[PDB]
Design a protein around this ligand. Structure first.
Ligand code: ATP
Ligand code: ATP
Ligand code: ADP
Ligand code: MG
Ligand code: MG
Ligand code: MG
Lengths: 188, 501, 47, 469, 486, 157
């Protein structure tokens, strides 16, 4: 068999297998950026009410699905990789879970260019000065080449403090867990 | 629902439009080899149960034709196959060589010679999986197949074209029955009555090679190898070989059957072909059934034993007798596979493992041994003597757990039962069998001691073979015991008895 | 589990064989006596 | 329409269609075969795929082969031309005498007679066998079963029944052999030709053999019963005449379904049987019936795996018969042939109203004395038999005499026993058992009754034993 | 296209359609296929629906259109069914025209609670001595009839059904009992001969035969008991008394197992799903005896079970033995040695007990039970017979007579007063001086004699429901006088 | 079980040790009627050896068949030949037991090697009847039959 080039991040499931196949196809020929473009364009195309309703009916012959998808991939002059991918999905019958596929690819592309995702949780909004110093400190966690991809969020449950997720690392500065730890210590 | 071929290595080929460069019609690539079963991607034109040839000389047999891959079984050890190996068709349903060249060779399940005497120079090949004769080709079993074992030839007669079944616990003497049968035909094969020559085939399934080597030595010793084939799929051999060995042997015999010749084939054991089949099926992810045996383990043996037939004279008059050997566990003849085969055959020899210690060897458990063909496949002289002998044993068998009349009955029964013992690899001509049975059933041993009949048999046989061979020749050629022959036998028996003490 | 009637014969153990043999013994004896009496009657009836 | 094969696994083939889909039970012909391979549709899996069971070996099938939907279930020739022939499951002849040229074709799948169409009359059918006629009388138009282990007498008994009844029958007959030895099929064919029942030259045959012997792949053994049943259906309805229908074996019709079940994707039931055992057998056994527009006197041999009458298959069949004659291995070991078990064979016409007071009283007397003997054997095991009282030694002796007298020599067993086959009309059986019970034969040895016909023959045999004594 | 009130078959095969759509379909609702075929929606899954087809799947293609009828399964009810033969859904199959029932009921309704009921106290006369005296059955009971093959269970049921004719032909209204006979997985010719037999005894003017025969699809055999139980709950809830006979309840379990294994539910023991208890309990718990505030009606049940080799520890036999208020074993060993009905009175029980016996039958069977109990523990000696004292000798000389009184014949149930008279003669001791073989004759004679001359005494026993010492003395005189001249 | 059931076909000589015998104190617990060999041939081990071995097995098998009755009706319900057979069978069952060298720590007894000729001779004698006067226990855990006679002498005092 061929030596498919391993994508940076590994995904699993049918979505992950299709995404890995597409990533290794595009990586050879160095067509990642454009391929992502056509993928995020079929993302909009497939949401079209007519196509969305037509592709979920199981009572239209599969060949009809493939013919319609070839029609809708020739009009946009999609790269041969994306047209082949969509024909493949229609043949195998997995296009019902295309959004999981393309989404996975997006993830598999972020990890390529270093967008190590993060996530900050707090009980209130954050002042842009405080948020900016936060970003500046969080940047110190990464390596060279990587760039932070922050994502603010709000939860009321945690009283104060803060919660930070940096890829896999996780620091719970929240006051909820501090209170719980103190309560356990002063019970046990 | 994830197809086997829904992998990255394949979908990548599909995506970047490179699949057209490779042949996916008469060729395939191993997706996943493991435990002796390959999945192959490609071979869109491979026939079901066709043979295929891997890229290292190993062969396989494409059993499963799934929508996207092919479940192939390797006729060997998969140590040499690797994911990505190229599998290329052979074009033909799996078939084995046949002919008279195999005679006297220790061939292997696929027809390769493992005796080291050089290649088999065969000419024709037969598919292993062929249909058995129909209703019309056959006729009723009429000729006798002389086993050479007093008990079998007397009370469990076996005809030519009949499927017996030697069933009994482990180490009770089943292979011994088979080898007595093979060695006996030596007298017929060394002769000119071309219509009585019988060609033997021994299929050794899942038996250690030391056993098969000792058996082949035993056959060469009696020079019973010039007319014997030995299809040896021993324990070390992959499951598919042990599953195919019976069919290779059966086709080697269908050859002699389809040419007016008479063959005997001895599968030993069939309970190990069933185990090999179960392993194969479970490794192809086929759902199990009883005791994990695949759902269709009856058809497996029925389609094998149904090929033992007796062709009419418009089809050559050939014949193929089958003697499957089954092994019960604790006399539990009511198990799954023993019960499967007991209803497929017509007749059955019950080797009991306590008749085997109480003294009776061969352990044949008369009364439970039947031959649905019956007296129809017996010699006239043996018919005559066995008619009385079977009845007398049948009476003695219900008063055995002990007057004057019944005491005489018990004495006679014990005399007969001591007349049915025998050694090994020493079968007897039918004439001698009828001679001794007649000696014992008329009453010319009602006084001699029980422990002395074992030796009187041998002494009387030596005497007749050395003094009155003309009588035996007359009985054998005439087939029946003529009145003058009966009187000659009476004279001889009384004379030897008087001067034996 | 319960006990049936005539299960000793069914079991086929030593007791079943022993029972069958005993019964055969007794009825062999009685059959011999009846055959003798039948012959004697057939001779006593020609007169 | 026209589909293409997509997967071959054992005897189960999936076929993908692009035109309309063929309903279930249709027959699809595989294109490109030397001999006709017919696939009977069995499931719709979605995506215009159908899962099917091949009626003949799937050797040498190729993914992508073309398959044509015949458009209707397996259709077989019928009419008075199939008489004397031999047929496959798919109806094409296998006796090498040219095609079966009929006007009538019938589909082997058809619903059963509605409840408003059944008959309710019952008249004993004298067979000439003492045990069967006495303890479990058969009935004209009724379904009859012979439950046997292996090698007890099912086939010899059914051949005896053929010989007796089919020869003396005004109507036609049919013998569907489902998955039993081919040696036996050939034996029966030659026996009939040599006995005049079949006739090769002219049109005077009264039997329409059908064969699915045990070399046929399971898809075929599970259907040939329906084919023989269709021929019998026609003779019952269109000819408007009485019919016989011997089936041997009816276990293989269940065993084949079990064989194919797992590959069809069904979880297995109790003992490895298919989950649909009961209904797959009801839809068949409910077409074998008398109706207001005909009559079928069906007889069926039934394997009992390992002599286990509690197995799901025989256990389920017991409910579909009007009369069962449970052959037994224990009785066959005593040499009594037929081995019929007097205390397990039952019937629905064994009533004082349908067979008469005296017949009923005698049958119940035989059963009761045998049961008493069974109870006594337990005591005889320990005490010995000399210790028994004098009202019981009589019971044991009489019971042994009755056991022996229930045996009989058949005309088809002359090869085994050497004796001459006999027929004992009903009156002789009832009179002889009345006398044996009353005590009118305490002076004859029991062995005087072994393998004899009417009672007078037992008397003559006793006299001959005495004389030769 | 509509995918809420309508759907389309994704798949079919072995009678289990897999439908896509039908988003508003309720569980256990009756949908209809385009081919005039009905079906019941059992599996509601996120992606599809598992419909069990009431009929042959030959007519259910793929892509067919299925429309929901909007209702749970329901069956007709009323006295318009009496004397008819209906199938598992109320459709007539006797070809006497339509059924013409105004009302309807849901098959899957729930049983009455704990307060509506009242303790079982009336006797349900089966007309069989061995049952009416030793294992009595009240009204509102559930008395399993468990036995082997061809031991006489269906005959017990039919004798019970035939007996009620004397009550139904009278004018007393609280003794009338209406019978329902659910015949599950039976050869149609068996049901036809049974209907003929009931007509012969003229017991088919108050009987409803529900027929779910062998050819019928699995859902119909699964559903027949509930149809019958609803047609019986109709009589229960209207001050009337019903008696429903499921025959058998093991074949309903087999059909349910088939549907489950084809819907791919986790197998369980013997491949029976986990609901083969819930299935039978929520059926047999509908046999009640409503108190007066609810009408006073009742509904007895006599489930019939076949046991393979007398194995009553199997799955379904034990499931249905732990649900019911008794059980009537029918052993074959006793069947063949003259004891017919072959009611093993050792293993048979009735947890209701003598609370459901008429005072006369209580008076007599109370001591008959003890006499047979004593006989059963020295039965083994019967063979030896001699060599034993007069105590056990008299025990097993009384036991034999008592046993031979309990023998009875096809389709000839006896009125309670006649059973009381016979058992009185037998147990008070007016038979110990009689050869056992003649006992039956005596019975068949004595009975007739009493029926002819002394009808007034029988009327007094029947009405008073008790053996008053005046009636006791008169009966002793009658027995003595008759036994003198025999 | 599938594992031993499968391995039974790969061995020349099997030796089935059984818990039933070991619970009787006999050691080694070998079961005489399940042990087998492929060289139990009169042409390999001679005729005296083969005949003695087969006589031992015949008598042990007869005693096993009797055990079913013996366990209920006692030995007082056997013919005289049957009583004699049972006595010989018990003597042989005991005589098969041997004390091993490695089991001194268990038993204390001294471990014995019994040459083949001594074994054949002893069993031939027990079968002939030369020792019907000794008691069973005289044979329990002894080497050659000389020690059996010596122990029977010890027990008599
Ligand atoms: N007639 C006989 N007389 C004496 N010994 C016999 C006789 N037949 C067989 N044996 C002995 O039985 C032993 C096993 O016999 P054999 O191997 O033929 O039976 P088997 O059951 O096929 O063995 P296995 O099943 O283990 O392969 C052999 O050692 C042989 O010596
Ligand atoms: N009280 C009785 N007296 C005499 N015979 C009886 C009696 N009850 C039943 N029988 C006989 O027993 C046989 C079987 O009867 P029945 O059909 O009642 O048993 P069953 O259990 O319903 O049979 P199945 O299990 O096959 O449905 C019948 O032929 C009948 O004649
Ligand atoms: N009536 C009979 N008389 C004598 N022997 C019989 C009789 N019936 C059966 N047998 C013996 O029992 C065997 C059983 O074979 P058969 O009944 O033909 O097959 P099945 O196993 O189907 O019963 C026969 O081959 C025959 O030897
Ligand atoms: Mg061997
Ligand atoms: Mg047969
Ligand atoms: Mg019934």
């Amino acid at each position: 068999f061929a030596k498919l080039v391993r994508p940076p991040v590994q995904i699993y499931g049918i979505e992950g297998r299709y995404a890995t196949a597409l990533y290794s196809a595009a990586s050879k020929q160095n067509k990642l950026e454009q391929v992502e473009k056509e993928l995020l364009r079929v993302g909009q195309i497939l949401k079209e009410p007519k196509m969305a309703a037509s592709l979920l009916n199981p009572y239209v012959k599969r060949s009809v699905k493939v013919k319609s998808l070839s029609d809708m991939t020739a009009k946009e002059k999609f790269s041969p990789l994306t047209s082949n991918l969509i024909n493949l999905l229609a043949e195998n019958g997995r296009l019902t879970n295309t959004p999981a596929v393309i989404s996975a690819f997006s993830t598999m592309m972020s990890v390529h260019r270093g967008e190590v995702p993060c996530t900050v949780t707090t009980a209130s909004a954050l002042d842009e000065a405080t948020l900016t110093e936060l970003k500046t400190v969080l940047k110190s966690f990464l390596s060279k080449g990587q760039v932070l991809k922050l994502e603010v969020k709000i939860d009321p449950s945690i009283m104060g403090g803060m919660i930070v997720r940096i890829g896999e690392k996780y620091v719970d500065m929240s006051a909820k867990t501090k209170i719980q730890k103190l309560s356990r210590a002063m019970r046990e | 629902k994830t197809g086997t071929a829904e992998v990255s290595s394949i979908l990548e080929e599909r995506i970047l439009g490179a699949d057209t460069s490779v042949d996916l019609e008469e060729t395939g690539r191993v997706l996943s080899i493991g435990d002796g079963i390959a999945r192959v991607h490609g071979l869109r034109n491979v026939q079901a149960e066709e043979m295929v040839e891997f890229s290292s000389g190993l062969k396989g047999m494409s059993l499963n034709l799934e929508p996207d891959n092919v479940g192939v079984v390797v006729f060997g050890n998969d140590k040499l196959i690797k994911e990505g190996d190229i599998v290329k068709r052979t074009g033909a349903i799996v078939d084995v060589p046949v002919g008279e060249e195999l005679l006297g060779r220790v061939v292997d399940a696929l027809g390769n010679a493992i005796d080291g005497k050089g290649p088999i120079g065969s000419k024709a090949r037969r598919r292993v999986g062929l249909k058995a004769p129909g209703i019309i080709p056959r006729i009723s079993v009429r000729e006798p197949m002389q086993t050479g074992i007093k008990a079998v030839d007397s009370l469990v007669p076996i005809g030519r074209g009949q499927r017996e079944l030697i069933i009994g616990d482990r180490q009770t003497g089943k292979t011994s029955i088979a080898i007595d049968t093979i060695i006996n035909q030596k007298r017929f094969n060394d002769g000119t009555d071309e219509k009585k020559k019988l060609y033997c085939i021994y299929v050794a399934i899942g038996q250690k090679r030391s056993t098969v080597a000792q058996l082949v030595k035993r056959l060469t010793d009696a020079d019973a190898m010039k007319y014997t084939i030995v299809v040896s799929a021993t324990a070390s051999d992959a499951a598919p070989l042990q599953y195919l060995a019976p069919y290779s042997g059966c086709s080697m015999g269908e050859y002699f059957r389809d040419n007016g010749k008479h063959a005997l084939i001895i599968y030993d054991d069939l309970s190990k072909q069933a185990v090999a089949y179960r392993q194969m099926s479970l490794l192809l992810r086929r759902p199990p059934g009883r005791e994990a045996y695949p759902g269709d383990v009856f058809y497996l043996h029925s389609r094998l034993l149904e090929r033992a037939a007796k062709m009419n004279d418009a089809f050559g008059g050939g014949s193929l007798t089958a003697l499957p050997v089954i092994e019960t566990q604790a006399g539990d003849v009511s198990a799954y596979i023993p019960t499967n085969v007991i209803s497929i055959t017509d007749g059955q020899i019950f080797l009991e493992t306590e008749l085997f210690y109480k003294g009776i060897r061969p352990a044949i458990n008369v009364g439970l041994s039947v031959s649905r063909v019956g007296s129809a496949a017996q010699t006239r002289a043996m018919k005559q003597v066995a008619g009385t002998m079977k009845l007398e044993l049948a009476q003695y068998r219900e008063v055995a757990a002990f007057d004057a009349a019944t005491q005489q009955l018990l004495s006679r029964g014990v005399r007969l039962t001591e007349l049915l013992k025998q050694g090994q690899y020493s079968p007897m001509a039918i004439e001698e069998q009828v001679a001794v049975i007649y000696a014992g059933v008329r009453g010319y041993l009602d006084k001699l001691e029980p422990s002395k009949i074992t030796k009187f048999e041998n002494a009387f046989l030596s005497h007749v073979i050395s003094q009155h061979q003309a009588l035996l020749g007359k009985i054998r050629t005439d087939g029946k015991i003529s009145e003058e022959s009966d009187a000659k036998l009476k004279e001889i028996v009384t004379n030897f008895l008087a001067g034996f003490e | 589990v319960r006990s049936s009637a005539g299960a000793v014969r069914d079991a086929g153990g030593a007791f079943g064989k022993r029972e069958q043999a005993e019964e055969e013994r007794y009825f062999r004896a009685r059959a011999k006596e009846q055959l003798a009496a039948l012959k004697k009657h057939h001779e006593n009836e020609i007169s | 329409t026209t589909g293409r094969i997509v997967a071959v696994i054992g005897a189960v083939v999936d076929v993908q269609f692009d035109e309309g889909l063929p309903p279930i039970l249709n027959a699809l012909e595989v294109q490109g075969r030397e001999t006709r391979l017919v696939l009977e549709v069995a499931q719709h899996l979605g995506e215009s795929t159908v899962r099917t069971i091949a009626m003949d070996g799937t050797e040498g099938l190729v993914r992508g082969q073309k398959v044509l939907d015949s458009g209707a279930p397996i259709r077989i020739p019928v009419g008075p031309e199939t008489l004397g022939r031999i047929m496959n499951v798919i109806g094409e002849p296998i006796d090498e005498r040219g095609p079966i040229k009929t006007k009538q074709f019938a589909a082997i799948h058809a619903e059963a007679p509605e409840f408003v169409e059944m008959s309710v009359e019952q008249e004993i059918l004298v067979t000439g066998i003492k045990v069967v006629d006495l303890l479990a009388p058969y009935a004209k138009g009724g379904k009859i079963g012979l439950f046997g282990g292996a090698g007890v007498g099912k086939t010899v008994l059914i051949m005896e029944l053929i010989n007796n009844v089919a020869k003396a029958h005004g109507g036609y007959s049919v013998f569907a052999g489902v998955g039993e030895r081919t040696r036996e099929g050939n034996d029966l064919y030659h026996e009939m030709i040599e006995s005049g029942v079949i006739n090769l030259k002219d049109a005077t045959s009264k039997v329409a053999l059908v064969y699915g012997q045990m070399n046929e792949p399971p898809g075929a053994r599970a259907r040939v019963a329906l084919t023989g049943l269709t021929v019998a259906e026609y003779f019952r309805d269109q000819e408007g005449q009485d019919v016989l229908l011997f089936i041997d074996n009816i276990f293989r019709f269940t065993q084949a379904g079990s064989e194919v079940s797992a590959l069809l994707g069904r979880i297995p039931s109790a003992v490895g049987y298919q989950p649909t055992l009961a209904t797959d057998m009801g839809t068949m056994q409910e077409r074998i019936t008398t109706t207001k527009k005909g009559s079928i006197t069906s007889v069926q041999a039934i394997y009992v795996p390992a002599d286990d009458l509690t197995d799901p298959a025989p256990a389920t069949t017991f409910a579909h018969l009007d009369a069962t004659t449970v052959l037994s291995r224990a009785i066959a070991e005593l040499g009594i042939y037929p081995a019929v078990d007097p205390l397990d064979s039952t019937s629905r016409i064994m009533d004082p109203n349908i067979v008469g007071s005296e017949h009923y009283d005698v049958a119940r007397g035989v059963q009761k004395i045998l049961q008493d003997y069974k109870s006594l054997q337990d005591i005889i095991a320990i005490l010995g038999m000399d210790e028994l009282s004098e009202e019981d030694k009589l019971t044991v002796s009489r019971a042994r005499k009755i056991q022996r007298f229930l045996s009989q020599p058949f005309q088809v067993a002359e090869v085994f026993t050497g004796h001459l086959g006999k027929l004992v009309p009903l009156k002789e059986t009832i009179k002889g058992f009345q006398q044996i019970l009353a005590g009118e034969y305490d002076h004859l040895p029991e062995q005087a009754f072994y393998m004899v016909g009417p009672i007078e023959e037992a008397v003559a045999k006793a006299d001959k034993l005495a004389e030769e004594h």
